[PDB]
Every structure is written in C-alpha cells, then in structure tokens.
C-alpha cells in the first residue's frame, strides 16, 4: 500500500528527527499504549526463493506463500479454506477438498511449507493472547519482502511492516494506522508504543537505532 507506506515514512521521519535516545531523562514506559497491540504478525518463515518462493505463518496459524511468479496462496487456520491472489490481485476463494487441478502443485508446495514450519520452527509472539473479535478481522497476505545481511523485511497488505533482526532475534512490527510500533526484545518481551509519544518521552538506544534502520528500509520499500 503506497499510501500506508507514505504515512509510516512520515511517522518514522518525525520520531527519528526528535532523537528520542539523546535525552537526560527517558520515560519509555509512558509511551506505551497496550490498546495498539497488532492483530496479525508473521510468526515463522522459510526462504525457498531459489526454487518455489517465500513461505510464512501468521500468528493465527494460517499459512501463506508468495511464489516466485508473484501469485499468493493462503491456507486459513481451519485447514481447508483457501484464497488465491493472482498477479493482477484477482482474488479467489476455494477449498483444499475442492482439489483444483490448476492449483495441485501450489497446494502441495504450501503443505510442505506448513509441515516444515510446524515441525522445525518456533512461533514468534506465542506469549501474546488474542483479544475478542480478532477472528473477524480480514486476513492479510504478504505483499512484498526482502532480506539484507542483518534482517528480513515483511510488508503485509494491511499496511503493516515487520522487521526481524537475525543475530539477536529482536523484532519490530510497525502499524501506520495507529502510528504505533511493537518491539520484541531479546528476552521475547512484547511492548507496544505510540511513535508520537516516543518523541515526547524518549526511549533506549536499542529501540531508537532500530527505528532509524526501519525508516531506511521503508524508503527501500517505496523505491521499488
């Protein structure tokens, strides 16, 4: 979403311009707003882009794939419902039991992705409990993604941008609708902040340096 990435870029420019870590007093706790906790994030992923594409699991246990041919296939958490997004954005809804002939391969590959992730990878944010009515939210798909030497950047179709850092396992989940960011630290503790309140109360250098990196990555998302 070009308009959501633009708002997030402005939001990041603002907070980074205030230099939130260069302050005598930092009251990062006052910038917290638990009401902004995200509904969806990426909890697992596998880069098979050499052959098939990028497989991933969302925190609601749904699974999706962004194939190299720029189509997408989402298996809802019931294990049967399916959504297929062509290169044109042409959405379609089917079921695994329908056993479509034109999707046999992609369906099989998605199951392989699902099986590997379930049997070999940890669920990020497993300690985050779901609020009532989160089941009604529309399920997003992975619009675009890329990896640097230090992180993977995942842009969801609801406007959210997620950045997972490889070495220390810290993660950012940015929500331009709330002008908010959720940070998962090395100890796996979750905290959600209003970006505008970080400008006004400050934060530690760990989070500030990652918000500087995030802005750079949002510019890269907007380039292509």
């Amino acid at each position: 979403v070009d308009c959501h990435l633009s708002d997030m870029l402005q939001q990041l420019h603002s907070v980074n311009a205030s230099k939130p870590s260069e302050r005598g007093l930092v009251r990062q706790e006052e910038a917290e707003d638990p009401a902004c906790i995200p509904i969806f994030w990426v909890s697992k992923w596998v880069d098979y882009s050499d052959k098939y594409g990028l497989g991933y699991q969302l925190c609601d246990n749904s699974v999706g794939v962004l194939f190299n041919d720029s189509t997408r296939l989402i298996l809802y958490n019931d294990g049967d419902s399916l959504q297929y997004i062509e290169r044109d954005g042409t959405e379609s809804y089917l079921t695994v039991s329908s056993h479509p002939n034109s999707l046999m391969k992609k369906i099989t590959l998605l199951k392989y992705f699902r099986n590997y992730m379930s049997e070999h990878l940890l669920k990020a944010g497993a300690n985050i409990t779901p609020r009532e009515g989160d089941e009604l939210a529309r399920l997003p798909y992975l619009r675009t993604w890329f990896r640097t030497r230090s992180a993977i950047i995942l842009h969801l179709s609801n406007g959210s941008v997620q950045i997972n850092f490889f070495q220390d396992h810290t993660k950012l989940i940015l929500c331009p609708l709330m002008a908010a960011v959720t940070y998962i630290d090395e100890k796996r503790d979750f905290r959600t902040y209003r970006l505008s309140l970080l400008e006004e109360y400050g934060c530690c250098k760990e989070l500030a340096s990652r918000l500087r990196y995030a802005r750079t990555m949002v510019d890269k998302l907007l380039s292509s």
Binding site: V46, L121, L122
Partner: protein, 49 residues
C-alpha cells in the same frame, strides 16, 4: 480394452507438445524428503532451542 489406440493422426515435435496425460505417478516436485532438506540448508526463521 474398449477404447482404441488413436494413432491415425500420428506423423512431430509439436505432437509431443499435445502429449498431455491426465493421470500419472508422483511428480518430481512432490518429494517432501528433498523439500524438507533444502529448507534445512536454506535461510529460515528461528528454530527451537
């Protein structure tokens, strides 16, 4: 068998292009052992520890 062998329109390179069996044994992509292996050697998210 009751269906005939239909080789009355046979000859050649595009005749192999019209060769479209509706049913066959397991395809090369459907090797889950090899799939899981590549995933193990490729970049992925954090494993259990």
């Amino acid at each position: 068998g009751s269906k005939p062998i239909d080789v009355f329109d046979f000859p050649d390179e595009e005749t192999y292009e019209t060769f479209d069996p509706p049913l066959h044994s397991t395809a090369i992509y459907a090797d889950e052992e090899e799939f899981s292996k590549h995933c193990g050697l490729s970049l992925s998210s954090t494993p259990p520890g």
